[PDB]
Design a protein around this nucleic acid. Structure first.
Lengths: 55, 76, 111, 45, 82, 366, 127, 137, 187, 103, 345, 54
RNA sequence: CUAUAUUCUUUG
RNA sequence: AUUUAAAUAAUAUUUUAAAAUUUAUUGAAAAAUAAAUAUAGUAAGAUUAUUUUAGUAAAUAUUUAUUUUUCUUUGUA
């Protein structure tokens, strides 16, 4: 349905316009790294798939 | 209820010939939402004089200005 | 810009009352709201902590996180006592308080 | 509903066997006793 | 649901998000044909015309007949109710 | 229990062993005696300047409106605000000037802060809105799932007919009454609320938190956040050399990493960013107090296979600045790049707020 | 009074009697007798002419009761008969409001006079 | 013991030390702690349920005497009814003398939307009517 | 269409006479705000269309050269979001550049009619409280505009002056020497 | 206080100097020296500890302990329970009845 | 139902009824010392009966007949003179009143003598009441202005202000009263519970005394023709009054009707830090002495002042992930060493 | 509801008492509430604030 | 309610 | 077109129970098995936290409003 595809990359940084409902108050030393992994792989997975599909 | 004694002051119980019973008489005494200002003609308004005194100060010579005063408005 | 619901702030998970809301998160079906409460006369454990919600930033070994009381795992040495000092796990010798001359004196717990 | 179980749970020692053993029975006994004596004290003695 | 249950350990159903009603569902048109609301903010009547009309007009009187052509506020219970 | 309830006052004897511990205990000497911890006000955190050191020119006092420089001092270079300063509604109405620290811990040139940003005077309801937003937002919403009456996997049939038995009237006993059962209206992620928060409120509350950090004297302004190497011991070498307390037990540092005066960046300094994962109490956040508008593409019910929460589908990400992580970490370390970016993004915002007889003079004043 | 009808109770209310055992002092004017006549099977009465009332309390005889009434403050408890408890509430509320305004007007008057002294001082100093 | 209220944290920000001091607007009492039972008060949880019949039945969930008029309905929208949202001339003049809008310029609906004097929600087809409300010149 | 200061197309068809308007001096102060935040916006579009990957973790490091936008999307973002934003900014620029041409004329007419002093004094927007929003230290004796109203120098007498002293034996702790007030506890 | 001598001997006050629940620290600050100056004979012993017992305790001259739960109680209340500690000899609790009026 | 209070009605128990202590002059300071700073530039007496006699006395004095108040005070002052030791408070109190009585009847010099004796008795007192010294020198102020020494009278008044500004706590009288408006749970009826107000001219008599003290001073300054003096006095008076009004301040709590949280009053009437003592005693000025021998935490360089204990092994930081498998333990291996190089020395 | 007051707000209220002797006045950090006052009292508040020089 | 009455008026 | 406000968000709505119905299988010359949340104020039963602070269409309950005149008194909306 309409999930707002056009706002996906609109954000200034890599971590916004991403629905992140799996989270906590305190993020540990490696949970933070996990967060920064998740976000950039969320951008990279979705970009590389959209490259592959159309190519 | 439908009692003869509804909505009356105990002095007025004697007058049976005009019972105050009914729903709207309950609304005009406890003055409720159609009657919130009850009697719309109540004392202290007069249509006949509009609370102004009818006295003629208009007298030609200023000497006898108060000549017509105490001219009765009714039998008194 | 309705202000965020305070009942849902995470500090409170009541046990399914009559009153509530669609957004009030009550607990699981068949789980009591306080963990040490297996009965109503159940005591609070003394030095045993159960970390809840966020990952504990310092996990003492005798405490509980996603765990049970597994006593060999929880305390390696029963004689030894574990406490937090200067943001580290620091491990002292366990003492018992025993009245001597009318003050209370510390004796080595094990022996 | 508050029946005052948690205060009267400490009194049971003054009840004989069936009441002092089992909780609810004893609590009914103590609730009855104290309400009774309260009533009596205020209006009669 | 307990870590022993043969009930929950074999999957049966999974309940989804339930759809909401039409936001305007309750403004029903049988009201919108009959009445119309008139008012300044915080006080508004719903007003309607009278039926005595389309059965017997003749023979009654003209005053009681044209007491029917006025807009009138509905009774407050009905207004609260609607 | 409750103060009133008779359960309170219990344990008349036995609460204390009647006998002193022969190490820590002592008698009260008299009115000349200074007790550890004792203070006339209700301090839940009784920290003094030794335990939680504050870095500012003066220890904050009721005589001082803020514990910083009110006039540029003649012995240090003074850099004026990036954008011209306008005094809006809640602003301190007094000049706020803060020293800048080098990475070697000596004081370098002095820099004027913006009272629209660092002067918005904190009142608690706004900060409350901020905090409740952050603590409701930061739950794990995927863990709220629970079983329901139709989810149990029993037979749907009446298990015994209710006619002649003394047994309860029971059929299809997968209900909530029973040990193997499930509720009628359980909790589960797509029924849980995620609060929407508009930009005005976020902006205002974060401004007031920054100002609160100024008034408590816990604000620090630094040239760069930069490490020699990406390694962690370089980071700890830094935190040790300039006296940041990063231990879990100690009060932590909250970084806003901006680049520098000359070369500000929206991205973190790479070198510093990789060294910044220490296990201790510290956090590095994006250099912005604003937020994107929060859109809900299921506002009615529409998409049913949404797992999600119900609410804003664009919650503020975790590396932003907030009330929670401000209240947790004491020193707020702000790079000048961050200062510049804050002023830059808040300029038009503060301009629109002004009354119209005042906004007309803005072009005249340049 | 709960043994008796609400009219008798209204009369007892006008006589300022609530319960059994309460005693009140009321005037001899006709209206009062109109009230006491109706409740006479409850109330028991005694009479004091005003010379005797002047005697009952040490009151010099050259002093009337009108001046004595003119001296005592209106602010006495349960001062008025106001028609409903809400009005009573706002009567007490206004009683407090006049206090606040008394102190505020005091301070504001002081500010006024200080302002005038500073004005005259600056005017006499410049000139 | 004394919790810091909103006045004490206003005077002296020094004592706002942790998140528990961040209590919301005092008009918030708490969660709904009881039952609004029709015709008897606000009752208590674990109270007398004797009067709850109406409450329970309400918890689980004449216009025909009036004639129809004008088959569509009285105020009825149809496609192409011109229903204008009002623009009061006073609002406009206030906007001009305030300094939102150029007097020097032909004022279109676009300039009204851009200057923010009229909100997006207000805009609908057909756009606006210029009404003189309280303006004699 | 409209959107400039001249008029829409349907006034040209209408033939309304808009040409000999009266020119007044309007500072165009609101539009400069809108222009500031329009020009702020255009650049953002140019930045977010031009993102390319730099991934700092090894698993995601196979993409490090590519744009974050799929080219087919990047093109469409150039048409829809970006180059029309330039048009918005453009409109603001036009609406100001008209009016400097007009304000120059108002200033010249008033310079001839009045003289430079009188003219420039009339064309000034100064409000008597403009010091409240710009340099408040010149406004302090006029009104108390502080959030701290107890620290304003007119009300400053209210806040107490403690007598405090540092202590070496307590570790550098400063401590107020004032005696406490005895409190009412009982009734 | 019998024959010119207070029956109370010690007051045990345990508290945590750094942790939380300020009421006892308040009490030590503002209300204690007013008590000590008024009743000099009573030895007050203070017990700083990490997880403090939140109850006050008196010790009388017959060797009787009496304690009051102070958890999140205002220092006014704590002061009052203290002054309640002094005013009792802790010998008995007789009911207040007609036969108990004369001891 | 409405109450008529026809029968006897006991009062309610209410927080304004607290027994409020009297302000005392500090121990080290003597009043005559400050006066020199100014010069620089028990036996049984039926006290119930005599007290009754005394209040009859100042009913006479308030009632506008002074001679009789004088004899009354005479009797009662003989009584107090016998019943109390040297320099007791009620003794010097009643001869304050007695000086006031002499002054009104035309015995001016007697009043002067008496009030000077009051002064030298306030001198020799251990810790006199802060109210009594103020009242005393107010009396000598008015007596002096009656004698025709106006400069010295005004001197006395100004010295009243300079006493009460230094040694008096302005917020103490209203400490318990300040939060009372928060008791009201009802709105349309009984809403005078939310508006409860207590005038400062009642709950501390000291403020009233210094206030009319300055009023008299200002009048004298108007008569003599001193403008600067009058401005000084009115400024001090204004500052006094809003010093008081500042301490009576508060923000409104819940406003509308709040049904049944009645255990909330336990938060409403408590020790409320007064704004005066919020700004005197603020935690950053008046520091909390925090000793480290009772605490398990110190700063870095002070690392060894922690509460000592029997043999200690520093194991590691409490990293929660050492309970997991071998790969999580392959991580976090070098943390500990790196933590020891953070905290060394 | 009166919001944009910045200063000593209690002086504002102490004059607001004189304007509205009968009504109920409440203070909060951001605002001042006057109760049972309609557009009339709004018109007044504005006349007073304009007359006052704001 | 549906049909017949189609101007201010009229049926079942 | 004489003619005054406004805090723009919706997602929820007790609980356990018939005789029934409907769908799809098996078997014998309607029964069993498997799916559903049918309905149940004259069928019913439960519904979780004391020390309390205003009364009894019309009534009662929640929020809220009016200082309308006398010798005293009065919950009216």
């Amino acid at each position: 349905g309409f999930t707002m595809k056009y706002k996906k990359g609109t954000g200034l940084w890599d971590e916004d316009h991403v629905n992140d409902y799996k989270t906590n108050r305190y993020l540990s030393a490696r949970a933070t790294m996990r967060w920064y992994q998740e976000m950039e792989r969320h951008q990279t997975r979705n970009s590389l798939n959209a490259r592959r599909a159309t190519q | 209820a439908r009692s003869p004694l509804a909505n009356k002051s105990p002095d007025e119980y004697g007058n049976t010939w005009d019972p105050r019973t009914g729903v709207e008489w309950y609304h005009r005494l406890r003055r409720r939402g159609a009657y919130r200002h009850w009697p719309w003609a109540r004392w202290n308004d007069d249509p006949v004089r509009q609370h102004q005194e009818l006295s003629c100060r208009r007298t030609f010579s200023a000497a006898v200005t108060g000549a017509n005063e105490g001219v009765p408005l009714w039998n008194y | 810009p309705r202000p965020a619901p305070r009942f849902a702030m995470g500090h409170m998970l009541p046990h399914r009352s009559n009153v509530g809301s669609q957004f009030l998160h009550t607990q699981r079906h068949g789980s009591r709201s306080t963990w040490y409460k297996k009965h109503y006369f159940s005591l609070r454990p003394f030095a045993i902590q159960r970390h809840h919600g966020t990952t504990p930033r310092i996990l003492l070994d005798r405490s509980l996180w996603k765990s049970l009381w597994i006593t060999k795992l929880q305390l390696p040495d029963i004689n030894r006592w574990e406490r937090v000092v200067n943001s580290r796990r620091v491990t002292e010798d366990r003492y018992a308080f025993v009245e001597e001359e009318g003050v209370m004196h510390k004796v080595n717990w094990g022996l | 509903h508050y029946r005052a179980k948690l205060e009267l749970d400490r009194i049971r020692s003054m009840l004989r066997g069936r009441a002092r053993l089992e909780r609810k029975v004893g609590l009914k006994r103590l609730f009855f006793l104290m309400r009774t004596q309260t009533r009596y004290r205020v209006e009669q003695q | 649901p307990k870590m022993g249950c043969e009930e929950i350990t074999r999957k049966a159903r999974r309940v989804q998000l339930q759809p909401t009603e039409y936001l305007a569902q309750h403004r029903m048109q049988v009201w919108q044909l009959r009445f119309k609301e008139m008012g300044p903010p915080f006080s508004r009547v719903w007003v309607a015309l009278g039926g005595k009309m389309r059965r017997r007009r003749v023979g009654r009187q003209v005053d009681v007949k044209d007491m029917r052509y006025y807009w009138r506020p509905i009774e407050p219970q009905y207004q609260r109710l609607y | 229990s409750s103060i009133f309830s008779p359960r309170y006052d219990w344990r008349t004897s036995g609460v204390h062993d009647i006998a002193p511990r022969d190490e820590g205990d002592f008698l009260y000497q008299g009115p000349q005696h200074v007790l550890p911890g004792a203070h006339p006000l209700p301090l839940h955190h009784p920290h003094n300047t030794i335990t939680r050191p504050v870095i500012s020119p003066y220890i904050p006092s009721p005589q001082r409106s803020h514990p910083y420089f009110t006039a540029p001092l003649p012995e240090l270079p003074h850099f004026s605000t990036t954008k011209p300063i306008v005094y809006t509604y809640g602003t301190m109405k007094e000049r706020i000037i803060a020293p800048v620290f080098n990475l070697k811990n000596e004081v370098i040139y002095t820099r004027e802060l913006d009272p629209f940003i660092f002067g918005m005077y904190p009142e608690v309801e706004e900060l409350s809105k901020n905090l409740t937003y952050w603590m409701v937002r930061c739950q794990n919403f995927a863990s709220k799932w629970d079983y329901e009456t139709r989810e149990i996997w029993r037979k749907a049939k009446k298990n015994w007919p209710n006619t002649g038995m003394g047994m309860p009237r029971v059929g299809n006993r997968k209900n909530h009454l029973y040990t193997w059962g499930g509720r009628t209206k359980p909790s589960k992620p797509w029924n849980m609320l995620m609060p929407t928060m508009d930009v005005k409120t976020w902006s205002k509350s974060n401004r007031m938190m920054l100002t609160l950090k100024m008034l408590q004297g816990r604000l620090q302004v630094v040239d760069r956040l930069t490490l020699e190497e990406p390694t962690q011991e370089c980071y700890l070498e830094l935190c040790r050399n300039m006296s940041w307390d990063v231990r879990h037990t100690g009060g932590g540092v909250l970084f806003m990493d901006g680049g520098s005066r000359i070369t500000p960046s929206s991205e973190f300094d790479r070198a510093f960013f990789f060294g910044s994962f220490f296990n201790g109490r510290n956090k590095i956040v994006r250099p912005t107090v604003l937020c994107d508008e929060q859109y809900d593409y299921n506002k009615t019910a529409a998409k049913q296979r949404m797992k999600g929460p119900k609410g804003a589908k664009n919650p503020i990400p975790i590396n932003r600045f907030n009330a929670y992580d401000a209240m947790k970490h004491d020193r707020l370390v702000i790079t000048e790049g961050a200062l510049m970016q804050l002023e830059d993004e808040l300029y038009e915002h503060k301009l629109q707020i002004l009354p119209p007889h005042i906004r007309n003079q803005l072009p005249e004043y340049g | 009074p709960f043994k008796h009808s609400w009219e008798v109770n209204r009369m007892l209310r006008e006589l300022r009697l609530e319960f059994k055992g309460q005693t009140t002092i009321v005037p001899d004017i006709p209206q009062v007798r109109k009230r006491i006549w109706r409740v006479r099977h409850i109330v028991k009465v005694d009479v004091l002419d005003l010379d005797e009332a002047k005697a009952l309390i040490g009151v010099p005889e050259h002093i009337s009761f009108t001046d004595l009434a003119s001296q005592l403050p209106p602010s006495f408890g349960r001062v008025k008969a106001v028609p409903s408890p809400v009005i009573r509430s706002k009567m007490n509320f206004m009683k407090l409001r006049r206090m606040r305004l008394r102190d505020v007007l005091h301070r504001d008057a002081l500010e006024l006079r200080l302002l005038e002294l500073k004005r005259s001082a600056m005017k006499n100093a410049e000139q | 013991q004394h919790k810091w209220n909103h006045w004490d944290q206003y005077l002296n920000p020094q004592i706002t030390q942790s998140i528990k001091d961040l209590t919301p607007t005092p008009e918030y009492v708490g969660m709904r702690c009881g039952h609004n039972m029709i015709k008897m008060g606000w009752m208590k949880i674990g109270g007398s349920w004797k009067y709850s019949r109406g409450y329970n039945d309400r918890r689980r969930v004449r216009f025909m005497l009036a004639p129809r008029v004008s088959a569509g309905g009285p105020r009825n929208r149809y496609e192409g009814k011109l229903v204008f949202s009002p623009l009061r001339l006073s609002k406009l003049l206030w906007a001009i003398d305030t300094g939102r809008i150029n007097p020097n310029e032909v004022i279109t609906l676009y300039h009204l939307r851009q200057a923010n004097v009229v909100g997006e929600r207000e805009i609908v087809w057909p756009g606006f009517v210029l009404i003189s409300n309280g303006v004699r010149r | 269409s409209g959107a400039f200061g001249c008029g829409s197309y349907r006034s040209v068809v209408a033939g309304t006479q808009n040409v000999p308007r009266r020119m007044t001096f309007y500072p165009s102060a609101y539009e400069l705000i809108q222009l500031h935040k329009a020009h702020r916006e255009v650049i953002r579009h140019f930045y977010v269309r031009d993102k390319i990957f730099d991934n700092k973790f090894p698993g995601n490091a196979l993409a490090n050269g590519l744009f974050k936008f799929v080219p087919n999307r990047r093109e469409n973002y150039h048409m829809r979001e970006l180059m029309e934003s330039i048009r918005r900014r453009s409109i603001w620029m036009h609406r100001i550049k008209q009016q400097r041409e007009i304000n120059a004329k108002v200033v010249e007419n008033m310079e001839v009619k009045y003289g430079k002093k009188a003219a420039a004094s009339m064309l000034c927007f100064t409000t008597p409280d403009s010091n409240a929003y710009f340099a408040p230290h010149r406004y302090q004796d006029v009104a108390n505009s502080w959030p701290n109203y107890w620290q304003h120098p007119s009300v400053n007498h209210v806040v107490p002056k403690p007598r405090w002293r540092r202590h070496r034996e307590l570790g550098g702790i400063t401590r107020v020497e004032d005696p406490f007030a005895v409190q009412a506890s009982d009734y | 206080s019998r024959n010119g001598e207070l029956c109370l001997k010690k007051v045990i006050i345990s508290y945590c100097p750094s942790n939380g629940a300020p009421n006892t620290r308040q009490f030590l600050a503002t209300h204690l020296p007013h008590f000590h100056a008024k009743y000099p004979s009573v030895s007050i012993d203070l017990r700083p500890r990490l997880w403090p017992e939140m109850a006050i305790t008196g010790v009388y001259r017959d060797g009787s302990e009496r304690s009051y739960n102070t958890k999140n109680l205002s220092p006014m209340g704590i002061f009052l329970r203290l002054n309640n500690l002094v005013s009792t000899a802790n010998d008995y609790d007789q009911p207040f009845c007609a036969s108990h009026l004369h001891f | 139902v409405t109450r008529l209070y026809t029968s006897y009605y006991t009062g309610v128990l209410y927080p304004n009824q607290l027994v409020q202590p009297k302000q005392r002059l500090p121990a080290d300071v003597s009043v005559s010392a400050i006066l020199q700073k100014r010069s620089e530039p028990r036996p049984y007496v039926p006290l119930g009966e005599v007290a009754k006699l005394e209040l009859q006395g100042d009913y006479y004095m308030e009632g506008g007949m002074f001679q009789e108040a004088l004899e009354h005070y005479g009797v009662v002052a003989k009584a107090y003179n016998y019943a109390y030791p040297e320099n007791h408070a009620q003794r010097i109190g009643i001869r304050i009143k007695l000086s006031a009585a002499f002054r009104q009847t035309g015995r001016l010099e007697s009043s002067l003598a008496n009030i000077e004796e009051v002064l030298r008795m306030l001198d020799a007192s251990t810790r006199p009441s802060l109210e009594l010294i103020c009242e005393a020198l107010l009396e000598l102020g008015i007596t002096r202005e009656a004698l025709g020494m106006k400069r010295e009278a005004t001197e006395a008044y100004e010295e009243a202000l300079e006493v009460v500004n230094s040694f008096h706590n302005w917020g103490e009288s209203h400490r318990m009263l300040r939060l009372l408006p928060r008791l009201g749970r009802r709105f349309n009826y009984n809403f005078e519970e939310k508006f409860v107000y207590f005038s400062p001219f009642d709950y501390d008599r000291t403020f009233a005394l210094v206030d009319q003290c300055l009023e008299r001073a200002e009048t004298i300054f108007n008569e003599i023709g001193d403008v600067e003096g009058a401005i000084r006095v009115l400024q001090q008076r204004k500052e006094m009054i809003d010093k008081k009004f500042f301490n009576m301040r508060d923000f409104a709590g819940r406003i509308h009707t709040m049904r049944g949280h009645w255990k909330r009053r336990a938060q409403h009437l408590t020790n409320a830090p007064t704004p005066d003592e919020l700004l005197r005693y603020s935690p950053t000025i008046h520091q909390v002495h925090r000793d480290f021998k009772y605490e398990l935490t110190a700063p870095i360089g002070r690392e060894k002042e922690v509460m000592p204990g029997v043999n200690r092994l520093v194991l590691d930081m409490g990293n929660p992930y050492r309970r997991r498998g071998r790969l999580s333990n392959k991580m976090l291996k070098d943390a500990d060493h790196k933590f020891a190089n953070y905290v060394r020395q | 509801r009166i919001q944009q007051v910045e200063g000593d707000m209690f002086r504002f209220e102490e004059e607001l008492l004189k304007i509205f002797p009968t009504k109920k006045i409440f203070v909060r950090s951001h605002s001042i509430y006057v109760y049972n006052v309609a557009l009339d009292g709004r018109m007044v508040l504005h006349h007073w604030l304009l007359g006052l020089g704001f």
